[PDB]
Design a protein around this ligand. Structure first.
Ligand SMILES: Nc1ncnc2c1ncn2[C@@H]1O[C@H](COP(=O)(O)OP(=O)(O)O)[C@@H](O)[C@H]1O
Ligand SMILES: Nc1ncnc2c1ncn2[C@@H]1O[C@H](COP(=O)(O)OP(=O)(O)O)[C@@H](O)[C@H]1O
Ligand SMILES: Nc1ncnc2c1ncn2[C@@H]1O[C@H](COP(=O)(O)OP(=O)(O)O)[C@@H](O)[C@H]1O
Lengths: 409, 112, 409, 409, 112, 112
C-alpha cells in the first residue's frame, strides 16, 4: 500500500512549534544574556554579536544542507544530499505525528543553542571572524554527524544509547569544542593577577531564567508529541533543577561560607544539563538524585577541576556542560532501570551492558568533537588568526571588533 | 576663596547637605566614588574566583566657600557626618584662586 | 465497567504544559525582576536569590508530599500521603482530560509564585536563612491546607466558593503572610528619613511585562483545557489589566500630579490580581469594571492604606495583592451573575448566599495564613534570628548575605 | 442547514491562545525594550510608559467597538456596530476552527503592536497626552478601516491582495503614521551637533530577541490553525530573519568597516518585517531572498533614505518598517508563484495582475494612514500641544512628564 | 601650572570640547556629577512616596594648563559653556605644584 | 600636606594599589572618569550615526599624603602604572591646607 501516508496531529503540531520557539528563546536571548553578564562590560556586545551572528549562520546552513545530512537516510555516520534547501520534502510530509517542516525547525534549534554554548569559552580574546569560520567547519563536520549517530538512526542509536534530549549531542559536544578553544587561544591578559568580576549579575539571572523556561520545550519537546513521555520529561526538569539549585547552594554554603546568586544560577543549569539525557527515561526519584549529584559535580567542576586543568574558560562551559553532561549520561544508564522508578531498558538489555554503551557514547562524542574543533580553530588561525592583539583585549572587543559601546548617556 | 572637599559614608549625605543649608550654603557638587582604607569591603565570591578584599562605596562632596566660613563649615560637617565607626570620612581643604559664574560673569564672592 | 479509563486529549496536554511553563516564567524571572528593581542596588541580588532558592525549595516539597496533601482524597482541611514522591500515581493516569503529571506541575507552579510574592514585603532587612525556614513552615501549614480547602474538595469548595485562579489561595494568602513579616521585622533603617527609590525601573517594567505574559497561562490554564472557558479567561485578562492600568494612571495623574511609569506597572498587577478569581466566571463587561475598581483600589493601597497601617512593606505586597485580592473575590460573587453577563451561579444560588460565601472564604484565608505566618516567623526568629544587624543593612544584603556585588566594571 | 455551525478544534484553540500571548509579548515588553534602549537614559521611562499606556488604551477600544467595526460585516471600508462590548457574540461562537473570543484577542494584539511601533518615531520630544489623543483618532480612523480592507472582507480582500501577517496592516500603516509625526513635531534639539547614542544596547538586544520570539505567534498564528501553512510560516520566519541578519552584517562590515550589534539586531527586524506579508505564501528559497533583500533595504533605510528626506525619526521606524514592509509586500506578489516554490496564486491570477494589487494595497495604505495621522496629530496639537518646551526636552521626559528617574543608587 | 575645573550642563560638553580644540588644548578629564544649588531638581513620585529635594546631573571637566593660558581659557570656556539659563555652572581655578607624565617622566608643559 | 591625583588606565589600578601599600599608603579615593588627549578611542557606529570623537575610560585616584613622601610616591606610581604606550596617564600635585579625620577629629598627618 505504497501511496499510504501518515496524518499530522494538530496538537502535536502546535506543541512542537511552541517547543521550537521555546528552544530558540534559549539562544535568543537566553545564552547571550547569560554569557553577556558573566564577562566584563567592555566586551558584552561582542558576546551578543557572536551569539546573534552564529545563530543566523547555523539557521541558513541547517536549511541548505544540514538537516538533510543529519536526518535523511544514508549510513551510520551521516544522511544524504536529497533534501538540499528542503527540496524533495513536501510541505505535507509527516515525520512521526508532525509535519516534517516542524521537525526541521525543532532540530535546527538544537543546533543553534549548541553553537551558542561553545562561544562562552572563547570570550574576551577571540576574533569575530575566527568564530564564524570555526562555526562553519565545526557544525558541518561535528554537529551534523553526531546528531545523525544519536537521533538520526545512526551508529550510536543502533547500539541502544540513551540520550533523550542531548547530553552528548548538545552539552558534551559543545563543552569539548569550548575546552579546546580556550586552550588554543590561551589565558586572558591579567589572568591570575587581575580581578575578573561579572559586570551584570541581574543580566546573568535573567538569561538563566530564560534558559530554564526555554528548556521545557527542549526536554519535553524531545518526546515529539504532547503525550505521557512529554509530561515525564517536564516533571523531571522541574525536580532536577530544584535539586541542583539546592545541591550547589548548600555545597557552596558549607565550603565557602555563603550562598551566592551565581551559585544558584549555576546550580540551575547544572541540573538542567544533568537531566537533559535522562528526563524522558527516569522516574521522579531518579531526577532528584541526578539533580543533587549534578549540582555538586558542577560546583567541583568550576572550582577544583578548573584549577587542575589550568584553563581560562571564562564562562566555565566545560566545568558545567561537560562535567554535568558526562555525569547525566552515565546516571541515565542507572536510573532508566525498572526497579528504580525508570521506564526500563530495551528488550534483553542489562544495566551493566547499558552503562558500557553510555560510556561508549561519551567517549565517541568527546573524541570526535575535539578533533573536529581542532581543525576548525586551525583553519581560522591560518586565514584570519584566532586571538586579537593584547591592546585590543585591554580596550575591549566592543569598540575594536564591533565599533560600539554598550552603556552610554 | 577656599574649596572644601568631604568624603563620607553614603547614608549620611542628607544630614550634611541639611547642615550646610543651615548656614546658608545650598550650592554644592556631589560625586559617587569608591574608597579603601582602615575599613574595607567584605569578601567576594564568583564561582571559582574569590576576592577577599574589596572597595567600598563612598560619597565625595565639593563646596566653594569663603575664608571666614572655613571655621564653621569644618565644625558643622564634622559633627553632621559623624557616626563613630571606622570609615566615617575625611575633610580636605585647599586654596581656590578664582571662581567664575558662567551665567552672569560674576567673580569670587558674587559667584557662589 | 471498572477498567474503563479516560483518554488524555493531546491538545489539552499541550495547552496545560505550556501554561505551566508560563506560570513558572512568572517566578523565574517575573516576580524576581519585579521586586529586584523596586529595591536598592546593594540589595537586588538578595532578592533574586531568595526567589530562586524559595522556588527550588517549593518544587521539592511539592513533589515529595505537597501535591499529595493538597489534591489527594481526605477530609475538609488536609488530604493524604498516598502520593508521596508521586508513588501510586501511574504515568498514564488521567485527571480531567490531561495526564495527572501535568496537573502536578501546573499546581506546583502556583505554590511557587505564591511564595515568591511574600518575599517582597521582607526586602533589605531579613536574614537569608530565616526566609527558607519560614517557607518550609508556611507552605506546609498555610498553602497546602488552603489550596485543599479551596481547590481540593475541602471546606470552602463544598460551601460553593468562587475562586477561578487564586484570589484566596494565592494572593490574599501571600499578602497576609507578607504583612505579618513587615510588622514583625520592623521598619528599615532610615525609614521616613531617607529616599528609598527603585534602583532600576526598566527592570521593574521587564518583571511586570513577564508577570503579565505569564499570567495568561495562570488564568486561562485554570480552565484545565483549551476550551471556551479558557477563551473567556484569556480575553478577561487582557481587559481587566488594561482597565486597571488606565484606572491607576488617571487616578495618579489627577491626585498626584503626573502619570508615572511605576504607576502603570502597578496598575497592571492590580488588574491582574483583581481578575484572578473572576476571569473564568465573568463577562467582558465585568472584567472592565473589576479592572478599573482594582486599579483605583491599588492606588489607595499603596498611598493612604500603607501610611495608615504604619508598615514598611517595601514592595507593597499587601497594597496590591491583599487589597485587590479581597476586592476581586467580592466582585466575583457579584459579576458571575447571569444578568451581569457572567457565567451564572450554581443551581439554586442567588447573589446573597454567594456574596456571603465569598466573604467567609476571605476571612478564613486571612486568619489561617496570618496565624501560620506568625508561627513561621517566630521559629525563624527563634532559630536563626529574622533580622540582620544594622551594620549589615546599611552595607547591603548582597555583600553580607551572598558575598557578591551586582554591578561591576 | 441554517443552524449548522463549525466545531472548534482544541489544538487550534490551544495554538491560537499561545500565539496571542506571543504577539502581546512583542509589545509588552518587546518593542518597549527595543525603543527604550535606542534612546537616551533620560527618556527611557517615557518610552516604557507610552507603550504601556497606549497598549492599554488600544486593548479597551478594541473590545468596546474596534473588533466589531474591523471584523463585522458591511461595506468595503468599515464593519458593523452590532458587536459592541462583544455583545451578541455567543461564547461558543466559532470563527474558522477556533472560538471567536480567541480571534478577538488575536486580532487585538496586532492592533497593539502597530501602535507600539509608531511611538518610536515620536521619541524624546512629544507630549504624553498628545500621543494618547492621537492614538484614539488614528486607531479608529486608520487601523480599523485598513484592517477591515485587507483582513475584514473589504476592498483589498475583494481585490485579492496578499498580506499574510500585516505588511500593510501593521508595518506600512505604522511607518507612515510615524514619518508624518516626526515631520510634524520636527528634529530633536541638538540634532546634527550632539551625540544621540543608544543608552543601553543590551536592552535593545533583549527587546529584539523578544520581538523575534513573539513574531512566531504573529506569523505562524496568522494561519489561524496549527496546520501545514503554520509550519511553512514558521520555517520561513527562521529563514528570513537569519538571511537578513547576515545581509545587514555583510553590508555594514563591507561599507562601514565593522559588524555591529545594532546592525545584527536591525537586520533581524528587517528580515521579520520583510517576511511578514509573505510567510505563509512562499517557499524556503524565496524567504532566503526576501530575507537578504530586506536586510539590505533596511541598512539603506537607516543610512541613506534617512538623509534623503531630512527627518528626525529617532528609532528609524520608516527606514525599517516602511522600507521593508513595502519591499516584502511587492516581493510576495512575485514569490507566491508556484515555479518559485510558492503556494501558487489564486485561480486565474498571474504574477502580472497580482503585482499591481500588491502595489495598489501599498499606495492606499500610505495615503490612508498619512491623511488620518495628519488629522490626529492636528487634533492633539490643537487640544493639548504636541511638543514639550526646549528646557524639558534637554532635562528629559522621564522626570518632567512622568516624575521619575530610571536608575538610582 | 594651573588646574581649571568647570561644572556644566551635560548637553554642553561637545561645545567646550571644540572650543578647547580651537585654542590647542586637546587633553582633558570628564566626570559625571550631581549638582544642587539655585537651580534644583523636579519632584519625583514612586508609589506612595514623594521626593521634593532632588539633584541635577552635571559634567565636571578638569583641564590642566600653563599659567600664560589662564585668561585665554576662562574666556573661551565661558562663551562655549554659556546658555544664559540658571544652573549653567561655574569655573574654578587652582594652582598645581607639579604635573608629571607617567609614560616619560616629563614635567609641566612637557607633561601635557 | 599634599594631594596627589593620579589618572591611569583602568586595569592598572591593582598594580598602583599594591605599590602604594609597599610604602605604607593604604588610604585612597577612586573615581571612574573619561579621558581624551593623544590617545583617542576608536570611532563608533550606530545605524546611520558616525561618531569620530569618543572618550576612553580611566581611573582617577585621590590620595592625601605627607610632604616628604611626595618624591617617593611619584617614583613608585610612575613605575607601577607604566606600560610605555600612550594614555598611561599623569600625576598631578596640589597643596592641602588641612586634613581632618571625622571619626576622631585628628588633623593633618594624624588624620591620614
Ligand atoms: N558653592 C558651591 N560649591 C560647589 N559647587 C557649586 C556651588 N554652587 C553651585 N555649584 C555647582 O554649580 C551648579 C549650578 O549652580 P546654580 O546656582 O544652580 O546655577 P548658576 O551657577 O547659574 O547660579 C550646581 O549644580 C553645582 O554643581
Ligand atoms: N590618604 C588618603 N587620601 C585620600 N583619601 C583617603 C585617604 N585615606 C582614606 N581616604 C578615604 O577615606 C575613607 C575612610 O578612611 P578609613 O581608613 O576607611 O577610615 P578613617 O577615615 O576612619 O580612618 C576611605 O574609604 C577613603 O575613601
Ligand atoms: N591637560 C589635561 N588635564 C587634565 N587631564 C588630562 C589632560 N591631558 C590628558 N588628561 C587625562 O590623562 C589621560 C592621558 O592623556 P593622553 O594625552 O591620552 O596620554 P599621555 O599622558 O600618555 O600623553 C587622558 O585620557 C585624560 O584623562
Amino acid at each position: 500500500h505504497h501511496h499510504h501516508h501518515a496524518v499530522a496531529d494538530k496538537a502535536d503540531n502546535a506543541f512542537m512549534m511552541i517547543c521550537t520557539a521555546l528552544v530558540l528563546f534559549m539562544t535568543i536571548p537566553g545564552i547571550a544574556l547569560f554569557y553577556g553578564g558573566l564577562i566584563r562590560g567592555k566586551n558584552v556586545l561582542s558576546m551578543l554579536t557572536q551569539v546573534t551572528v552564529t545563530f543566523a549562520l547555523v539557521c541558513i546552513l541547517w536549511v541548505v544542507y544540514g538537516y538533510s545530512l543529519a536526518f535523511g537516510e544514508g549510513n551510520n555516520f551521516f544522511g544524504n544530499i536529497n533534501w538540499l534547501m528542503l527540496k524533495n520534502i513536501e510541505l505535507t510530509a509527516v515525520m512521526g505525528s508532525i509535519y516534517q517542516y516542524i521537525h526541521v525547525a525543532f532540530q535546527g534549534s538544537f543546533a543553534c543553542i549548541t553553537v551558542g554554548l561553545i562561544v562562552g569559552a572563547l570570550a574576551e580574546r577571540i576574533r569575530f571572524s575566527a568564530v564564524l569560520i570555526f562555526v562553519v567547519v565545526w557544525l558541518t563536520l561535528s554537529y551534523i554527524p553526531i546528531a545523525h549517530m544519536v537521533w538520526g538512526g545512526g551508529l550510536l542509536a543502533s547500539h541502544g544509547a540513551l540520550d533523550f534530549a542531548g547530553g552528548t549531542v548538545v552539552h558534551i559536544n559543545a563543552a569539548i569544542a569550548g575546552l579546546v578553544g580556550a586552550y588554543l587561544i590561551g589565558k586572558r591578559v591579567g589572568f591570575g593577577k587581575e580581578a575578573f568580576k561579572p559586570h551584570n549579575l541581574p543580566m546573568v539571572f535573567t538569561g538563566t531564567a530564560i534558559l530554564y523556561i526555554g528548556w521545557f520545550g527542549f526536554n519535553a519537546g524531545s518526546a515529539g508529541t504532547a503525550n505521557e513521555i512529554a509530561a515525564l520529561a517536564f516533571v523531571n526538569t522541574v525536580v532536577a533543577t530544584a535539586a541542583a539549585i539546592l545541591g550547589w547552594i548548600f555545597g557552596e554554603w558549607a565550603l565557602r561560607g555563603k550562598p551566592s546568586l551565581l551559585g544558584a544560577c549555576s546550580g540551575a543549569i547544572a541540573g538542567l544539563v544533568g537531566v537533559t539525557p535522562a528526563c524522558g527515561y527516569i522516574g521522579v526519584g531518579g531526577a532528584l538524585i541526578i539533580g543533587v549529584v549534578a549540582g555538586l559535580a558542577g560546583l567541583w567542576g568550576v572550582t577544583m577541576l578548573k584549577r587542575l586543568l589550568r584553563v581560562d574558560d571564562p564562562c566555565d562551559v566545560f566545568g558545567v556542560h561537560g562535567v554535568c553532561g558526562i555525569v547525566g549520561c552515565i546516571m541515565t544508564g542507572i536510573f532508566a532501570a525498572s526497579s528504580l522508578g525508570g521506564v526500563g531498558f530495551a528488550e534483553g538489555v542489562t544495566m551493566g551492558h547499558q552503562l558500557l554503551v553510555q560510556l561508549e557514547s561519551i567517549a565517541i562524542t568527546i573524541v570526535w568533537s575535539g578533533v573536529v574543533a581542532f581543525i576548525g580553530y586551525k583553519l581560522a588561525d591560518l586565514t584570519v588568526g584566532l586571538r586579537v592583539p593584547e591592546e585590543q583585549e585591554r580596550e575591549g572587543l566592543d569598540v575594536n571588533s564591533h565599533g560600539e559601546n554598550a552603556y552610554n548617556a | 576663596m577656599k574649596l572644601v572637599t568631604v568624603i563620607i559614608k553614603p547614608f549620611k549625605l542628607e544630614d550634611v547637605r541639611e547642615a550646610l543649608s543651615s548656614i546658608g550654603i545650598q550650592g554644592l557638587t556631589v560625586t559617587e566614588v569608591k574608597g579603601f582604607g582602615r575599613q574595607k569591603g567584605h569578601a567576594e565570591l564568583y564561582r571559582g574566583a574569590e576576592y577577599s578584599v574589596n572597595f567600598l562605596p563612598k560619597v565625595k562632596i565639593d563646596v566653594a566657600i569663603a575664608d571666614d566660613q572655613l571655621d564653621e563649615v569644618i565644625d558643622i560637617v564634622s559633627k553632621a557626618a559623624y557616626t563613630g565607626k571606622i570609615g566615617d570620612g575625611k575633610i580636605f581643604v585647599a586654596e581656590l584662586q578664582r571662581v567664575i559664574r558662567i551665567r552672569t560673569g560674576e567673580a569670587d564672592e558674587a559667584a557662589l
